[PDB]
């Protein structure tokens, strides 16, 4: 709450990040722009973060643009963030996944240069009521960017925005790929739509078109049954019912169906709970920490970035607590196959 806690951490020769505690002060070489009031995270509760896919994307854009057009040609970009510690983790997580993705930064090197100046950040919280069971950090943010990147689900060269940022909105389905053609996690579809009056409640039918020309042949429902399972069998879709109560942690049984019928379909898998968020979210990190070998922490950030506010309170704990057999049950099934 001072101008002495400004600082000023240098990514390139002509980037620099800026945590700035008082009034940007100017310079004829110096350009400063902030994205504090132009990527903003849409939160459920007390989560501030981390920025979804499209704002990653944005951001990227918005550096890449910055650093090739002719009006700041010698000057020095300046990303720069506000006294909100909130906003400052978001700044830095889309300064580090910069770093990860349009220059050969390693996680560690990305945040290394980002907690130099003895910058201390908040770790991203849960979408739950009141504490916290569990943080996610920027570094956790890294590595599950990087191994995006490296397993292919992240892919800056061929990622549609606009296709991203209209499915995601609740009045267009409330949609979000976690795993190109393989996972979609979705909001849970009602017996009859009401789109109208600021409700954006959706029917199976909605879906439909789009699951098909994007080959998903699996539906798998998490959720109480607010609809008839044959809306979607009737449509050629291979749906099944795994219930697990709201705000709960899925049984041994259920987690080992979930990946069965995961490892056994042919092709997209499309899962829903209410929301979409904390149920899907807890069973999709099962199966990305079973056969991609990523950590809880690593896990949780990548469903994230990709759908905010999944993984919620107790979900937490579990992903945490199974990473070890997940990981062991993967190792075998490798094993196997060979």
């Not at 879709?237 to 942690?249: I, Q």
Request: proline share 3%; net charge neutral.
């Amino acid at each position: 709450r001072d101008p002495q806690d400004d600082v000023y951490l240098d990514i390139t020769d002509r980037l620099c990040f800026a945590i700035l505690y008082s009034r940007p002060k100017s310079a004829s070489n110096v350009h400063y722009f902030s994205i504090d009031n132009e990527l903003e995270y849409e939160n459920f509760y007390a989560d501030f973060g981390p920025l979804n896919l499209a704002m990653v994307y944005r951001y990227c854009c918005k550096i890449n643009k910055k650093l090739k057009s002719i009006t700041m040609l010698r000057k020095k970009i300046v990303h720069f963030t506000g006294s909100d510690q909130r906003k400052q983790a978001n700044a830095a997580f889309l300064v580090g996944c910069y770093m990860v993705i349009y220059l050969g930064r390693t996680p560690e090197e990305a945040y290394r240069i980002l907690i130099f100046g003895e910058t201390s950040y908040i770790p991203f919280r849960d979408a739950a009521y009141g504490s916290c069971n569990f943080y996610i950090t920027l570094l956790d943010c890294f590595h599950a960017v990087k191994k995006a990147m490296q397993y292919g689900f992240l892919n800056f060269n061929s990622f549609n925005l606009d296709e991203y940022e209209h499915y995601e909105k609740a009045e267009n389905g409330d949609l979000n790929w976690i795993i190109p053609d393989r996972f979609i996690a979705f909001c849970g579809p009602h017996s009859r739509a009401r789109l109208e009056s600021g409700y954006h409640q959706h029917s199976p039918e909605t879906y439909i078109q789009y699951f098909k020309n994007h080959n998903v042949t699996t539906i798998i429902r998490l959720n109480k049954r607010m609809y008839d399972a044959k809306r979607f069998t009737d449509a050629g879709f291979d749906h099944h019912d795994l219930f697990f109560a709201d705000g709960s942690t899925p049984t041994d049984a259920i987690v080992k169906e979930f990946l069965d019928i995961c490892e056994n379909a042919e092709g997209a898998i499309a899962v829903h709970s209410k929301a979409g968020l904390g149920r899907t979210g807890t069973l999709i990190a099962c199966y990305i920490m079973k056969h991609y070998r990523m950590t809880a922490a690593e896990t949780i950030a990548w469903v994230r970035i990709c759908r905010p506010g999944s993984v919620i309170g107790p979900q937490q704990q579990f992903l945490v607590m199974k990473q070890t057999n997940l990981w062991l049950e993967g190792d075998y099934f490798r094993q196997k196959l060979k």
